[PDB]
Structures are given as C-alpha cells and as structure tokens.
Amino acid sequence: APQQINDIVHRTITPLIEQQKIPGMAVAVIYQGKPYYFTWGYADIAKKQPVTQQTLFELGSVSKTFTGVLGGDAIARGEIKLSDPTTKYWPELTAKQWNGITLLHLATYTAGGLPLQVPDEVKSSSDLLRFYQNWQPAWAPGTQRLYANSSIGLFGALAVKPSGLSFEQAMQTRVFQPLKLNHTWINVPPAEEKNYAWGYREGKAVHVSPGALDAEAYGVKSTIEDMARWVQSNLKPLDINEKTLQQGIQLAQSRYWQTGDMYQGLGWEMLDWPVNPDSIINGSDNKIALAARPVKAITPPTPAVRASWVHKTGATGGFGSYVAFIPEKELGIVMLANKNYPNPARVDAAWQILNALQ
Ligand SMILES: *[B]([O])([O])C1=[C][C]=C(C2=[C][C]=C(B([O])[O])[C]=[C]2)[C]=[C]1
Question: Could you identify the atom of ligand 1 that is nearest to the CA of residue 120?
C-alpha cells in the first residue's frame, strides 16, 4: 500500500488503540476504488488469535445499512412501496395509532417515538404483535426522529414479506451473494467459528445475545475484506449487475429527512461533503445520535448525492464498528474493533484519515 496511506493510517490508529485500549482492530481504506488492509492485536485474547483479514467482527448497527439496501431492493423489485401503510403488510396490526404510519416512517425512525430497544420480554411472534399493538406514539408520524431498532427492525421484517423468503434468505440471495460477500453472516456457521472474534466488555469476552428483530437491526457479522467490498458497492452502485440491487443501493442513500445537518437515508445517514469535522464527530456521540429530534421532510427525497459523507456507527456489547465513504472522491474506510469505544473517537480517526487522503 502507498506509503502515504500507510503513514496516515498508522499515525492515527496506533494512538487510538492505545488510548481506547482496543484489543483487536482491522481497518480498510478504499482509495481510488482499491482496498488497503491493516490489522492489529487480538481477535481472541485468551487463545492468542490475531486479527487477520479473515476475522469476523460483529457489525452492530452497521447492519442497518444492509437492511436499508435489502429494503431498497424490494422497492425496486416493485414488491413494496415506502408510501404503503405499515398495515398493508401486517393487517393484524389493527390498533388505531398505526393509521398514517408508513413503511417510510419505520425505515427512518420517524413513526412517532418507537423505542430504541424492543423489550427483552418480547421473544415470540405473538409477543411482537402485542408490543406493537400496545405501543403509544408520543408524536404524530413524520415529525420526530428517534433512533430505534424497533423501527427499522420492523421495516426489515415487513419488507421481505412479499418475497416469501425469510429475512436471512432474502439478505443472502439478494444482497450478500450478488456482491460476493461470502464471509458475511447473520448466523455464523460452524465452519467459520474459528474466525469469529470475541468482543470485550469490561475485560470479559462476549458475543451478541439473541433478541427480537436482531437480524434486521444489528445482527450481521463480517470481515474487513467483505466490508471493504460493501463500501465499494456503495461507492459505485452502477457497477453492480443486478438491476434492482443497484437501484436499492441508490434508494438507501437518498435523503428522506433532515435533522440539524444530517440526512436520514435507509440505514445510511449522510451529510453534505465537505463536512465540518466537529459536526460529524460531536453528532456521532450518543448524547445526540440517540436523542429525540424534530425532522424536516425532504419533499420529495433527494436522490443519492455524490458529494456526501455517507456513514454509520455500529455497536454491540463487545464491538465497535464504523463505515464512512465519499462517493465523489472514490474514498472510504471501514473500522472494525472488538471493543465498543466512544463513537466520537471513531469518527475523529476516520476523518483524520480520509481528510488527509483528499
Ligand atoms: B438490549 O435490550 O440488551 C439491547 C439490544 C440492542 C441494542 C442496540 C443494538 C445496536 C445498536 B446500534 O446503534 O449498534 C443500538 C442499540 C441495545 C440494547
């Protein structure tokens, strides 16, 4: 890799790992449409297994980008419309508060205050229905944004219903397979466990626990290589052969709502490039990212803007991931670590790296 990329990456990541006490890390920089990989530390501290380009990391909420794109693919296929009412795909959802709540709302966290987490007690199909029937909106739909798994997770499950495929099967067949993400999983198979890194929380080795709508909202595990390939596919969707997938990727980068200077896509969040570092850095901090904010509808949605900083943070109990790319610059980065460290530190480092690369 160019000494320039090598120097900036190392100059930035070294102190990051040291200050955050990150056990293991893998980084991919996509420069002029080509990936460059870097790895440090351990995937498994106890068994002394190093992080390699084949190490699997939990993506946490970066999984929402795969869900937004899978959903976009369904839209392009003509199986669903974001303007459809949620009840069109779940007629059993009869409670009156659902009138007016569309798939767009679910996809974008703007249904009116659906919670960040689906309650732990919700673990059954009937339990899910019950939960949604009893949920009381705090706001009218399309007025406030509240980052939530119960919102996009539901969008995810409803989105694949017409296809007749299960969510994992649709994700694999319609997204993973066509893009050659052959080491990306919702459920990691036994044959691949040897590559599955342990996450670390307060010193303990941990893996994400099962939960309602986990696949749809935070359950994908991947390698730095496949994540780099994901970034490339998102940087140049026109290069994708499967027509509807190309269209789905574009739809997920369209701007549907604006909050402060951030725009909500399907899973991906975007800001106009150039961006103010402090704006994406401070904005990624959960004190802002997880808060209730008024939103302005973009009527109609702006098609994917090539001059944007497209990104998404992701976390599980033991993992911290980040993905960011600038279509206009053919530039991107993937940062996967097996420790959930502050979002600001992630964005700060990613910005130092990409800014120095143009
Ligand atoms: B929990 O009830 O233990 C629970 C479940 C899911 C989350 C969660 C997962 C992923 C993201 B994303 O931003 O990485 C946010 C929240 C939290 C708690």
Answer: 2
- Taking CA atoms only, the protein residue closest to ligand 1 atom 1 is 117
**Approach to solving:** X-ray
- Resolution in angstroms comes to 2.2
- CA atoms of 127 and 136, how far apart (whole Å): 16
Distance 267 CA to ligand 1 centre (A): 15
Is 61 marked active-site?
A: yes
What is the C-alpha separation between 99 and 76, in angstroms, rounded? 25
Structural domain tally of the chain?
1
Q: What is the DSSP letter of 290?
A: T
CA distance 146 to 109: 5
Q: Would you give the DSSP letter of residue 327?
A: G
Beta bridge partners of 144: 294
Q: Whose CA is nearest to atom 18 of ligand 1?
A: 117
User: Token pair of 129, please?
Assistant: 């229905």
Rounded distance between C-alpha atoms, residue 60 and residue 130, angstroms: 26
List the domain range (segments joined by +) for residue 322: 1-358
Helix (H, G, I), strand (E, B) or coil at 304: coil
**Rounded to 5, what percent of the chain is helix, strand, coil?**
40, 25, 35
User: SS3 for 29?
Assistant: strand
Question: Which numbered atom of ligand 1 lies nearest the CA of 60?
Answer: 14
Please compute Rg for the chain using Cα positions. Answer: 19
What is the domain-level CATH number for residue 325? 3.40.710.10
Q: Which atom of ligand 1 is nearest to the CA of 321?
A: 14
Question: Is 211's C-beta closer than 6 angstroms to any atom of ligand 1?
Answer: yes
Residue ranges of the annotated binding site are 61, 117, 147, 149, 315, 340
Distance of CA 262 from the midpoint of ligand 1 (Å): 21
Distance from Cα 208 to the centre of ligand 1, integer Å: 9
Instruction: Take residue 207 and report the two structure tokens written for it.
Output: 């893996």
- CA distances in angstroms from 83 to 2, 86, 87, 112, 317, listed in the order given: 47, 9, 12, 16, 35
Cα 34 to ligand 1 centroid, rounded to whole Å: 32
User: What is the dihedral sign for C-alpha 172, 175, 176, 179?
Assistant: positive
